[PDB]
Amino acid sequence: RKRRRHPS
Amino acid sequence: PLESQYQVGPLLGSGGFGSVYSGIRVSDNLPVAIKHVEKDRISDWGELPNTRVPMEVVLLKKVSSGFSGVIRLLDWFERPDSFVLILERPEPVQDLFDFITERGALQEELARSFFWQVLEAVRHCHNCGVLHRDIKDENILIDLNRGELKLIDFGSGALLKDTVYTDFDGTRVYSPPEWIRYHRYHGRSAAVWSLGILLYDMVCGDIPFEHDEEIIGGQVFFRQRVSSECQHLIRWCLALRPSDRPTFEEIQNHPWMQDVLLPQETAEIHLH
Numbered sequence A: 001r002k003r004r005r006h007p008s
Numbered sequence B: 001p002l003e004s005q006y007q008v009g010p011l012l013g014s015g016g017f018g019s020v021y022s023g024i025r026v027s028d029n030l031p032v033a034i035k036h037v038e039k040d041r042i043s044d045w046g047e048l049p050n051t052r053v054p055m056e057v058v059l060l061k062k063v064s065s066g067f068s069g070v071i072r073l074l075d076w077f078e079r080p081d082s083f084v085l086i087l088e089r090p091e092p093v094q095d096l097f098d099f100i101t102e103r104g105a106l107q108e109e110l111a112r113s114f115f116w117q118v119l120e121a122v123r124h125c126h127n128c129g130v131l132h133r134d135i136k137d138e139n140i141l142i143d144l145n146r147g148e149l150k151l152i153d154f155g156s157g158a159l160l161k162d163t164v165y166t167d168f169d170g171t172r173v174y175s176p177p178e179w180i181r182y183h184r185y186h187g188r189s190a191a192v193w194s195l196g197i198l199l200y201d202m203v204c205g206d207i208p209f210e211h212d213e214e215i216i217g218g219q220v221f222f223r224q225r226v227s228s229e230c231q232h233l234i235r236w237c238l239a240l241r242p243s244d245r246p247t248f249e250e251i252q253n254h255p256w257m258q259d260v261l262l263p264q265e266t267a268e269i270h271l272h
């Protein structure tokens, strides 16, 4: 299951 | 002159936080990080004792005195179109997002030590009048040899206040349901929500929610074996109503938080 960064 | 006081190395990363280079202070060979931020991309501004700087510089100076779990601002410069920030660089270092990606879900002993250190660092920010507003694994560096965690990237932060916040530019998947639903939140209780997201991330290997409907739905499914005490602390931090969340004192007195490892023990057992 894909894990990802998230921008800010 | 910035360019002669520092030897610039490879780009470490770029994003909403600017462009960050590895570096070396030419005077004593101190390892540093050099962050460039374009002036046009700076939404909030502040003032120091007397000089019109990015809010990020204001907040970093308020937390950078003495020793703490925050990466310290050593210097800054103004350029025609940008500000340049010199930050203290630990070596070797890895951010907590990459660490969790490579390791998977963390043993609870290790997550307890990490989460404890993050709590102490956030308490230090709040004691200095600083609300970070973007607590997440990506904004946490691990000093691998010392076993110490450091907060980075205050560019979404604010002065801490007790009245309502109606603006937000942190990471949405760590933001609380009252922001999603109403565009309103208070500083401390919103921070506790993001700490619940972070702790779940540590013990399960990824964050619990990706979509707005999951965030406001307030059901926490555990995808890994997690102790009942840890599940309880996480669900408490993730209470839908902000006033149902624990204080920092209540988090640190929770039974799951007892008998934390020291930083050096943490490195020797889990990082070396």
Ligand SMILES: NNC(=O)c1cc(Br)c(Br)s1
Binding pocket: B012, B017, B020, B032, B033, B035, B071, B087, B088, B089, B090, B093, B152, B153
């Ligand atoms: N956004 N990134 C920073 O503020 C960073 C500071 C240090 Br030290 C590293 Br390594 S990265």
